[PDB]
Symmetry: C5
Subunit: 269 residues, 5 copies
């Protein structure tokens, strides 16, 4: 069967197929995904009047990220259940082409608009010292865009052309390190001037950001983390990838937003 430049999920579903657990779990973890985002949207809106007017822009941007996140992640959950149908004879879910091939593209475009907002909102809670607001913002937005775009191109060849997949992934990584660098500066300059309590939170925010954001490139390689024809190049790798994405999404957006809200309250008078 000819699939072309398709995600590895389609190859597993078209050959081996998915077990009740593998299929159901992937459905539940994606469903929990968009559910958390709508729950977060309601939280950030109902807690806007809990911080000084100057910090409220942080809750608004968190809400903006939640909305778009809910829609894209919701569409993704529907794309999964639509691309795989149960086979009575063997008792496994196989690729149903009539429902379109499954693609992690809806999530990559969710990042495109999110990344910029997530990096931008912290600049409304913390105060830079030697770095210019506009300068930091422009760096985040540029590197952020190039990181997502390059990665979006590579994920299409994660099976059809392993070379292109890694080359683009590498280029993407370049911009990722630059973002980590700028964010590190923002955290340091942010700690200067605030109470020890605020510093404690910024320290936790940096750890959360570092770990949660690293999970994404991990999910990108998931199918090859145990080498070609490895343990992860199966339905196990599919479950792992979608699970990691969900954990990363909740941590990088919802939890990240809650911590910023807590810091905003700490600095509020």
């Amino acid at each position: 069967q000819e699939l072309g430049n398709a995600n590895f999920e389609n190859f597993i579903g078209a050959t081996e197929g998915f077990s009740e657990i593998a299929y159901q779990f992937t459905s539940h973890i994606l469903t929990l995904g968009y559910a958390v985002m709508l729950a977060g949207l309601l939280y950030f809106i109902l807690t806007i009047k809990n911080v000084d007017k100057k910090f409220q822009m942080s809750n608004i941007l968190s809400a903006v990220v939640m909305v778009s996140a809910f829609l894209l992640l919701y569409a993704q959950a529907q794309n999964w259940t639509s691309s795989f149908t149960f086979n009575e004879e063997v008792g496994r879910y196989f690729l149903d082409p009539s429902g379109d091939l499954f693609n992690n593209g809806y999530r990559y475009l969710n990042w495109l608009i999110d990344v910029p907002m997530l990096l931008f909102q912290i600049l409304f809670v913390v105060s830079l010292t030697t770095s210019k607001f506009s300068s930091v913002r422009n760096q985040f937005w540029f590197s952020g865009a190039m990181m997502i775009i390059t990665g979006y191109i590579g994920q299409f060849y994660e099976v059809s052309n392993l070379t292109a997949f890694l080359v683009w992934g590498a280029i993407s990584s370049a911009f990722f390190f630059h973002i980590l660098w700028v964010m590190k500066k923002v955290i340091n300059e942010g700690k200067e001037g605030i109470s020890p309590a605020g510093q404690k939170i910024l320290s936790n925010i940096w750890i959360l950001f570092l770990i949660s954001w690293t999970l994404y490139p991990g999910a990108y390689l998931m199918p090859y983390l145990t080498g070609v024809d490895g343990f992860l190049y199966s339905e196990d790798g599919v479950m792992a990838r979608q699970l990691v994405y969900t954990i990363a999404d909740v941590s990088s957006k919802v939890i990240y937003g809650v911590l910023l809200g807590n810091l905003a309250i700490t600095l509020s008078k």
Copy 2:
């Protein structure tokens, strides 16, 4: 027909099939389920300004539980009507594999995020005495997560492997008793310092929590409560399970939230 690690609902629907009453009732009870959650969401939002600012976090967390509860339970209602199609010849609903196998997973992931919030919101209304806030919270969140996760794994083998089903159920029960223990402490310490009216409510909250939360493990075993090839291992057991879940969900979330709101008002000045 090969189903594998699927819920017992699929086995009844694939062999005996469901009667108009059995199928329709299950559809109505699941529909009423998500309907109540959206009605509750509107109630908790419209009554936020009825309690002092310090207690408002309780209404917000109730609203958060309602939202996710509406989405997951809605999907669960669709997972039912889609998995069973009517057969004109015999006049019963049989497993329609094209609509995917029915799984009580969506409800298990709803708990995962709910359990933590439900246990945490009471800590914004009552005041601990001989227990540390962070300590109690960490215990609830840990045991709560382990309880749901372990149970989620077991429910997949409720037919394929009765042994694994019970072992996991038992492990889950362990964490459940620990939660009941901590909650009992919270209630007692909560009663100390408040008016007799507030104590009266906390007493009712403890009874509600004890009964409603016990229903879940009951629904877990529902198909075997009358032993293998028993009265409950039929469409009657399916109706019973989904009914008990719905009663438990409404009691543990909506009614539990209303009582907390009433207590918040009682302590409001």
Copy 3:
């Protein structure tokens, strides 16, 4: 073909079929149904600040009834259009089993949660004299629940077993008369102490309640009001039943809520 314990709508659609008018009208009247409930929801929310804080609980409960009413009635409207497909040869809509059998169950569960709220909200506008608040509430909630449950069971046998259908209907009627009795007391005690204007409204509320609530049992018997093989035991009876339900729903919930709001304004200072 054996339909079993199914509503009479399915028997008409499976034998005679439905004409363009019969089918279209039923679709339009059910569509208008959920449309009115969402319109009402918006009205009760936008008019909350039009009455004293003590009466606002009435608008909130009206809103709660609207929400659930919209969801259940929206589903009921889908249960119709899905259960009947057009036959080109004869030019009539016949039972399409793939879309499930049509059941007035979604509406019965909508009452289960509504009835309690509708009877309870009037206790926030009027002031009892010799009757205890808790006492009246408990009677409404108990008789209300037993009335709906018993009726829900009977409607399943409206064709399969005419005897069971009437027996349950009769038992249900018992609790209905008890509710009418308690409501009559509440109205009388409510009139005592308020202005002639307020009394005028309570008089209208009693008439509305009496007529609108009586329509339900009428819709229950609709198919046999002209005896077996009568004029109403046709597509005409189907249209009549769904029409009566819609009229009853709009009157008992929306109009009832508007009058309570007008009374609240009359008593507001």
Copy 4:
């Protein structure tokens, strides 16, 4: 093929079929329809605090009309795209009976709840002189209901029985002239006492009301405005009818509501 008492759209789609333009345009104009209503809903809600409390009831009723309008007009849109499928051989859209026959009913019952509200809201902005509020209201509500009901019956025979179609249309027209009469009185009495600016607006409101409301009966006859086997008794007549309805709906509800809001501001202090 037997269609029976069906709208003429079905006859054109079942015989000649629809061209890409005819089908696409009808879809676009109906889509724009419900889109405008949801846009209007947001406008009337966000501008409520722009007028004195006494006039705010006008914005609320406009919002009520928008909601219902959005739901019914959305359904009407779906009814279209579902009833006609593309034929590859000939390259035209033909009647797809599996999607139900297309009916302009959803739009008629929409007028049933709208008409009364649209005629009633103007009574909260203008002040009657010699006419009684209750009197005018009762006339609008009665004639309004009889006008819609009679018309709703006739539209079912616009093809099957041209005689019944015209008779009902005529009866409907009777109540329409009575409404125009009462509205004319309301406008005149409304002009007395208000500023020249307010009078200027009421003059515009009367012209808008006169033209927009006249379009409906025009859309009713659309298929026979060029006589039987005429230019309009084709896909051209279908486009014309749905276009006229959309123009009428936007003018009679959205624009009408905006003008009433502007008048409210003019009289606001």
Copy 5:
């Protein structure tokens, strides 16, 4: 295969078909489209109280544009995924007529209502000097309507009749230049009287307006920008057109609205 007066997307999908990348990308860019509009809607509503009451009409009109923009663009996204189904044998997406032919009409009607509001909202932030408010408004609204309508007619013949396609496109362009002319005047008169900061923003708004609005006519010709049987008259041209539309939509509505909000704040006291 006979398509008639259909968009070129259908001809590519009916002959060559679409690759996984071409199809998936178009789906992602359209999905991101409606997602951004709902995110913008939430932003404009949550920031209304950030500007003086006199400028708030700008946020309201932005919100109005977002709503209708979300619904239409959502409908446009669905029109895509439904019109093209995957072929297992060749591994490409081909025209699925059962899902209707794809038409960029839903986007042309979104402009019809947007264009007027987008041109009108700037008149609530800036102050004209020698130009009359009513005069400018009437010109925008007239030329705006004629521009969209004429273009909407031409796009139907972008393949069937290249002559009609260009003629209408040309006529449309005429009204486009007139709009650019009037907008230029508004910007100039707007700069007079405001601070250098406000002027800086209006300068950016003019550049954004000029570029973003020019993209639309570019997307209109996209398939012929490399001449007939050119590089762009392929799936590459389809991706390019939908991408350009998405960039134009986000820039002309969301970004344009954000800049107006920033200017409103700059002039706010």
